[model samples]
Target: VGRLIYTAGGYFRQSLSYLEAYNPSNGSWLRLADLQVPRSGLAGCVVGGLLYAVGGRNNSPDGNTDSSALDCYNPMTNQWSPCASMSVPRNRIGVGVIDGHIYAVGGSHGCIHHSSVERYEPERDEWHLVAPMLTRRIGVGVAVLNRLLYAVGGFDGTNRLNSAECYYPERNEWRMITPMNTIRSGAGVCVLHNCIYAAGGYDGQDQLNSVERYDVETETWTFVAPMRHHRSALGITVHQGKIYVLGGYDGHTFLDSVECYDPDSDTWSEVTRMTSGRSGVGVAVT
Candidate 1:
């Protein structure tokens, strides 16, 4: 009674081949197979059972070019393929997947601001270059708790950032933390137990129902409960134990409301409402 998979992002400003899947016992939504290439700030993760979709932007209405292939998705053959292609061309990335590869952090090929980082190897389909990122950001907010790799609050192309960085791939570098108390940029990052969360975004001046929680062993950052609206490119994960949150953009509509969060009553509820209305979507768990 679980299985949630959302990919290909962007709704109001184009770029989306919107694929869907969410069925927690009955809240339906099943419209698979739809992204051969039509994206928007892409980066959906999953390594073993397939489902990659990295790098974004097929442009429309505002552009800077991106997309280096790497689209895998294979509901056991509901097919979609192509790997190893990402040397540079990551438009808004920050994806994660530990021991099996796929990292690609820090985005933007548009207005500069990228701290490089790429790494995806689906068994030799290759795509290298690692260790880079201490600054130069762009809408960050990524996750992967204890195994490290958290890169929150972005937009350093000139202000809009409370800075947060991490990625200790066994010391391959990148460290500078304890930041993010406000000053955001397209937030919506996750990781449940060891903390890390981030949620909602856009704080260069608005749209953010404030939510935080870092704590990689007291590295600090605390402030939660606040998310009933005000979003910015939302879509987060962690099913059953709660913390769903999908559909984004509340700077004036494009949000098919859907919410969930209940770390044993730290509260937040309201789920069911996603027929469309999106903004940078990619929530997963399968």
Candidate 2:
């Protein structure tokens, strides 16, 4: 069971493609289906068995701007269709699904940091305004467990942030949570066994390889073994009790290397490198 889907390639541009899949067991990459449109810095989540790719930046190297575009892909049919657009256009935002709805948290629009929050109802094909975050942020990492959505480590236009906040849908409110020890942006986060894991992002001055874990039960952060490579904008997902980290850019260069973290061993090992060096790609376990 292996597949690799290559997205349409362009830096800071909106493009879409699902027409490729890589089989690690066989050491091969093959084409699959394509996305409806092209975009970068977008966030995706699997909800109700469908993959939803949300708000991202439109591709433009000279200037960066947000795109409200949202789309959903059905793997069974290999097709994509537009979904409700976000209330605000944003780049480098955090996204997660809770209770059958999609939540888009903080991000930057152009040079301005945003604290906006919105939720999309796929069944109703509509969008609703939720409580905004306490601070403006972009490049944040989001994860949901036990009905609460946590937004962590991002930049606030001026500097990288260490603060984290949680959203409670039942009350439609956000509250500050324990902050990360390091201030960073563009990190990847995922939930494994009810615990939240955050890894690799750029601190204001340099890239990072540090890894941290959060216990939802205690609402605290704990340092963990760092990654082998320091990176930002990398895609991460958990499969078979292992965390797989995909391509991302080190400040000086785009990367194609892949790494897997084994929580039980508290160690990281190199995996097969991706065929292309890419940043701001999305990932999901099918």
Candidate 3:
């Protein structure tokens, strides 16, 4: 990767097209090219050295619109260009990369939740259907560990979920995994030291600062040090052996605060704040 963290479009009063990059080394930010279309609730990942921003939604008085479009950003050119679109439009989608292929997991369209999954082949600029999850999910958190894709909690139309599952591309199938201790939607998820970390999110009742780690080999979840602030729809990524949690919602308000967790120490520390609070922000490191 390029050693810079990229934050894509997000929602405030409305969807935004802003794209920015953060240099952790200097703790400074630089504005990058704007996305062609304004969107929120999207998810993104870096594949083959290109930053790919996937599905999101646009809300307006006219009507709510869902985007299936994929936009690829090239760091060398400092520009964003349209790429292949997903077969279905989704908001609050979970995206991850495994073996160079980008996986778009379950999300929602209008009031309907989706269990469908898809993978993008960057070389061909195409997306194809993959086996769907056993349960519908939106606001789900996704991460890749040992080449397998894990889909964590999300709202499944009627309720917030604590359930989790994993996909094996080689077999083109999804299998259930041990559930989390708490129900979560929009949790910040990432993989570190071979363990999958699922952080703060919204349960059916409130925003959460609780954190947990899943040991894939042991198939068990254990509590970890929690974040300083409750967050849902936050951007999370592992950087320099620490997990950085960015701006998100704290139930009543949007959050501009940021925090980092050191798994080695099992403690969280405050970090630089974002220029503005962003909810449903798409994040990736390169």
Candidate 4:
């Protein structure tokens, strides 16, 4: 709760229940309580001082299973408690909080790609439908800026995307924004310096090291300095005015490495490594 980064369930050859925290002060990593069910491709965020792990997939001997499970973590007690589940099962979903409510954006239900959306209320411990995106997306990257929720690039079944859109909570509507310069699916998305940065993802043909930023004021996207490595399905969040991107697949293999970006310098520097390589990792700051 003080100044720690919490990372939960992810893929390390299989779905995982591991929950851990990184203390930037001392640069230490500590294992926390595991989730009740192992999951990957989930998205996480903090709301009301609690960390929430949303929908993802659980790998099994039979095949991958999509989930609607929602779990909340209590830092004080170091425990994870079950919360209300989402209406439809989703994996590779994106989540963001706006005005105290959490929004779960498009994801996949096996071969069924989704354009549907859901909103969760903690006080009521329930989830309800919201306006869907114009385009179906899986592994979308989501962030909120200026009270507007932005859904960025992802796969649309047949193609990786560069298109971006924003949600107006007041109207429960979505509007198209300028497309990104590069196609990105499973990109790490976060807001920093009044801009939305989308970094590293698969572009169908290859893994990407490209990065871009969108200025809401200008309704445009611009390329930023690329990362040292090409990655996708990574976990990302802003901390101490800098963006930290965690483990993901770097084309040929999974990575346990992490990187930090300083907007002032517009540069990325190598950071400490996680205990294991994790693609489809879920990250949140507290």
Candidate 5:
């Protein structure tokens, strides 16, 4: 099942809470170990049975600049450990694991959107630069299916984007995919039963309730049931065949509400609210 954990606030200098785990089975929340370093706009993924947290804005007023530090959490031990840092510090980057290697894609460092893509090998505790992305972007959604990684919608510094692209580790190249129908940034992407779903994000003018699906085999995009509330930077995941949307900001305020979509029935329903309101959180299945 997918469990979400996150810190609060978009600005730097705020203290973060203990990591919280959401149970999709019963829609219950439980406290996990507190992150050793508190930060915001962080990116996370599971690799080799451990959860690794990557780039984010640090915990200082001037720390809106990116962070390179990497941290890992072992759920079995409820412990945290330091991993090798990235060569470039960044926040809102797209992240995913394919074939046991963690790939950290485009993100922004202060005012700059990065085109660089970095790969981390846990066994060697190292990072290496791979082929750069086609365009500079931040707040992108990433997913891995059938050994290929997909990079979805994000900002290109000047505007929210509809662009989507994919990376093949074997060839070390990126290929553009179909653009989203709605241009947005900070959205979430999840794959369920071979279909890719992109949900909830902010267009330049407003937060979005839009959801769309992409069929990998056909390479086509289609509309899906939208979320009940508009949200940006929300955490999204697929657990037990259902799609879950977690905390994010809705333009006016941070949100703690949780919602889910059942693909089988094409319906939307409320789940339990999170313990705290937040934006830019990460979600994954254990």
Candidate 6:
């Protein structure tokens, strides 16, 4: 069994710093160390054995205090330590780990979404510029397939987007790919069996539970079985070949429900709910 580590997200006007863990064996919750900073809309990913949290905002309507703070958590020591800050302050960012480094990509500075991207190296304890996306977006879903990074749909500050693009670090360039079937923002994404899945988010019109999968081989997006309920701002991770989607917002209300999707059968099942509602959080199975 693996563990899903959830970091910082909350409902209403409240942002959270409390870090929690899910034990798949017993399907129970356990409180972990509190994040050094209290914030929301932060993005997280694991590099080596540490969890790196970057680019979130303090309490503000437009995220007026949008942050570039980088905090690293050591589960073994059960503590958090500050790291070098990001070059650009952002919230609702997308994060992923590749080549022993952390990449912070595509987030908003308020209402404006950015195409800028940054990469962080732990040894250097610093962030450096990388290639930017073709489209500026907020709430995009990001994942890695075949050693390359892909940025999925999000709000472009005008309309919800169905567009997608991928980055190859070797070339320091981004290329457009087949668009998703539905527009999405605040959706969760993960890769399994070399295929990328974008699941659950706010479409232009409403919160959605619909799921989409992209085949790198065929270069197309196809609808997968949707979740039981519509959700947005959810955290996603893969464990035991299943995609675990944690709590997020459901338009009218905050949610704590958790669901797992199995590609083998194209089905969604349940997992234990979180202790409280979460929106725009991070998840990783370890």
Evaluated with lDDT, which candidate comes out highest? 4
Show where candidate 6 strays beyond 4 Å.
60-64
lDDT, candidate 1, at 113: 73
Q: Rate the local accuracy (lDDT) of all candidates.
A: 0.78, 0.78, 0.90, 0.91, 0.80, 0.83
Tens-digit lDDT track of model 5 for 1-286: 4554433223312625347777766767768787776666777778767887788775565444577867888888988899999989878877889888989998878778998999999999999999999988898988888988888889988878998999989899999998889987999887887877889888899999989988998889889888998999888777677888888889987888889899988888988898877777756667
> Tell me, what's the RMSD of every candidate?
16.9, 2.5, 1.2, 1.0, 2.2, 1.7
Could you give the candidate ranking by TM-score, starting with the highest?
Answer: 4, 3, 6, 5, 2, 1
Better of 1 and 4 by lDDT: 4
Which candidate would rank higher by TM-score, 1 or 4? Answer: 4
Off by over 4 Å in 4: none
Question: What TM-score would each prediction reach against the true structure?
Answer: 0.32, 0.91, 0.98, 0.98, 0.93, 0.95
In candidate 2, which residue ranges exceed 4 Å CA deviation? 1-28, 61-65
lDDT for residue 127 in candidate 6, whole number 0-100: 90
User: lDDT tens digits, residues 151-252, model 4?
Assistant: 999998998999989999899899999999999999999999889999999899888998999987897888888998899999999999999999999878
Local accuracy of candidate 3 as per-residue lDDT tens digits, 1-286:
3488888988888887889888787778899999898888998799877998999998655667998989999999998999989999989999999889999998888877999999999999999999999999999999998889999999999989999999988899899999999999999989999898899999988999999989988999999988999989999988788898888999888887878898878999887788898788899998
Our tally of clashes for model 3 stands at 2
TM-score of 4: 0.98
Name the regions of candidate 5 deviating beyond 4 angstroms: 1-17
lDDT of 1 by residue, 28-86 (tens): 78778888778776768777877778877777676546776678878767777877788
Model 5, position 177, has a per-residue lDDT of 92
Error of 4 at 22 (Å): 0.6
